[model samples]
Target: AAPGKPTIAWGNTKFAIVEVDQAATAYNNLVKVKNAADVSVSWNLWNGDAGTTAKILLNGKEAWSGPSTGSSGTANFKVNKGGRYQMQVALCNADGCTASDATEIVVADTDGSHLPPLKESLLEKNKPYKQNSGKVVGSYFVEAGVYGRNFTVDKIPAQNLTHLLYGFIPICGGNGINDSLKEIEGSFQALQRSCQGREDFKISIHDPFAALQKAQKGVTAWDDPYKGNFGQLMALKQAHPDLKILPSIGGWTLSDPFFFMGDKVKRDRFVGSVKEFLQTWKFFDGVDIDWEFPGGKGANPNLGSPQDGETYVLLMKELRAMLDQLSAETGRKYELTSAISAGKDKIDKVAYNVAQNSMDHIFLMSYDFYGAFDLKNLGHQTALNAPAWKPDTAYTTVNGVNALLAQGVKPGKIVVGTAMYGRGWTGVNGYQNNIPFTGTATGPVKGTWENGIVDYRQIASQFMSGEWQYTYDATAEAPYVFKPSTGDLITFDDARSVQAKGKYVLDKQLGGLFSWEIDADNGDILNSMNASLGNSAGV
Candidate 1:
């Protein structure tokens, strides 16, 4: 039988926009071919003019056809005139030939400098939201927030943020498409497989229902494929065009797939998939790679390799190239940023010399320096500066920024990270000679979502009430709440601490400020960040 009607698609783009006299490559790929001894592909261009039928030219005429392989092909053509054109492809075999749906191409006389704006179909018709300009004010909007947290994309203070990093898109090991509802469902074997290298390695949405299918406004659009948080985010972006929304791939638990970069084939596949993902999800302005740590020190250290540091830089370079190509095609700018570690050990492993060149911003995760990990040392997690009581080895935002700068990373390219939640210990009392008195508590304090962690909103209402005593570490520029009655100590970032960090961002000439999560706060922290960044307060 003739090969079943093969589906044809553009290689890296959905639409074609080329400038006059510009030699461009038009690529086409065919899939779903069945029972074919040998396949041949052909192309045609339709000018869409009166009395003009579809025109076919010789292999070497008008357009120079490249070597046509089994299921894919490319053509090099230069147009001297500008016009609207439709290009179509056909596949042939012993039995018969099958035609493909036509793809629209708009050839322009200009140097693609003034491409048309995105059509209304791509954006929602909502009242535009405005934001004050200064440094970059960003936050992370977790997908899981839609569940028990009662937080959704609509609740994000988009007007006050210059960037919103959506957390997250996990890298898949098997088929590049993770369909798990639970966040931490992947296995060690999967991570091992990813590190071993697989061409199918791809990034996938952690929760499809929450990321792509759940209704937003208690209603769904008949033709809209993007619903849930994604749909709401699209509408949010339309309303707040100034806000740069990015899909942050990988986090604490999901960074295992970063090992895939060790292999060139896997790296290429991952990078290509990322480009396609960005193309399919046009609302996302760029991508944020939160690969915990490149050369180990993450959740599973064994998943990392000694070459991971070099591989990590290569991965960023590839991604940057892909994003730049897409930007050229779409006439829009695409950012490449990363959430890097603050520890000197982790920073030393990354090749900032090469990696910094590819990144638009290096978000220094300045928080989480100390927490339940070291119950005995109950120090501030998001301290701007190390307290005098702590040893010189203690991690601080100032130290992290200095380390990044030491690695030749420009200060302007660094964005300090702040935590919108607190890390606590239940059995913690007053200080013992300026040191936190860790009581009988053996583990992390009870938290809203998990142990040892509590949202800022909850901490503000319960812990920050009159009963609990609040303390500000002048040396560290950090805040914490102490419940004398229960011996509870929670190290967190309040409005004051957030503003302090923001001030640090300004004083150091850093890129800006970002929070690990937006749902954890009740607008106060974000507003404080805005206030310090010289931006209008958030609603």
Candidate 2:
């Protein structure tokens, strides 16, 4: 019975691997060696010594050479001689080397690998090991052109992730192509405002319903102002080669003409416009389709076509073909994804084949699911640990995923949406949505969707200032509460529950996770969400 040893990839990035060679924490690490017949040995990579190869030396003689090359520069050696074997990795280049102190890994047969493995990396049943680390993007809506240093993204993290998506970028500009160009420019300007210091980053357009809504002089493919923003984005990509920028279509209001175009010509023209945009830009990673609802749920005058679902898949297929042409032409895998609905009905009826075939990932808008369900009640804007602000505990992001996965969306492709800002609902009676008035509400009675929503970071002063009693429903798997004294209703994500969900995502190996906005969390909250260990989905 052989349990394979750990292996990793190293590169230009700065990192260190510590192994207490055969240093057993508890059980005897029965250093098992497989396919090591032709293996040779060497000295510490920092030194130029070898000779009598490792026959059984944790302190010196390198007994083996990995059949595989070491990551970046060095190789991993196991104490196959079955003694306490350990190693240390120092960063060395052609010019110099840092003498890293040694580390150890004990080799003895521990429990059988078949027995429920020890606290392995978090991955869940039926999920694939993540292909890439993950790119957790936050969706943007009305505030398309607002981010800047002064108006920065909250709690922005270092470029530690596989990718980061700055949500809500626009497609072709309406009015004039210049308007679209301005959107792209402003969005990039905003992205720079948020992520300039970070490296290996990615940003994308959120797709615009406004463009199609304001298409006055109707021509199939809009140019310049509409497509120019990507030029701005591409330039940024040129500077940061690791930076990835993808297109995201669909938002609350989807494109009318594009969504409901009955004519095949219109469909082809729409696809052509996108293709032309890509051709013109030449640096986009891929495209994302965000058609809000296929069978017509989004309130778009241009919303049409019962075959929108089928047509959407067709559209994506064409996008892929065009992308393939470009890839063969340039050799880049364009990322194709769709912004899917989070509600039960929307999800149950989601375009799966299109999703499976056409897009790279389905950025399920997990937030806004409880937004006044049919305006029923403004659910908790953000949660706080009950019993007053006592260090912020008890969370419920699980509800977001539990809600979606139940609808049959592939967990691996679904990324959880975290809100960077908290949503506040003002009107309430005795802290109840439909109850008789006990206290006055702040915004309109959950007001019109736009007028009602408020950002958590923007209004920290308005949060509940009393002993926040926690009320949780096992059924909903969410926890919430309302204070009678203050009519302020806050329901946004907190570290506790978000950590729970982040762990859930990792444990289940859901296609990397994302937050709604990065600018909302207090400080380093994203760090808490970066729980990647539990996501290995046991190989």
Candidate with top lDDT is 1
Best by TM-score: 1
RMSD of each: 11.7, 18.3
Quote the lDDT for 95 in model 1: 58
lDDT of 2 by residue, 1-539 (tens): 11112222232211111111122211112012232112112223323422211222235544433232332234444332322344433333334333334455333211111111112121111123332345453343233432241222112232323344534433332332112223333533432333223221122233232211112211112321211222233233433355455555545432433453445665665665566446434445667666667766665433445677677667777877877877787676777777666554555554563446666677756565434332333443333112232222223244445555665656787776656554544444543333312234545323212445544444333443455444443333234444445454545555455565566666877875555544444433344455442333313
Candidate 2 residue 404 C-alpha distance from true site, Å: 6.7
How well is each residue in 78-112 modelled by candidate 1, as lDDT tens digits? 44433334554544445544445655444322112
- Regions of candidate 2 where Cα sits further than 4 Å from its true position: 1-143, 147-161, 164-240, 301-305, 372-375, 378-409, 430-450, 459-483, 522-525, 532-539
Residue pair clashes in candidate 1: none
How big is the positional error of residue 115 in model 2, measured in Å on the Cα after superposition? 53
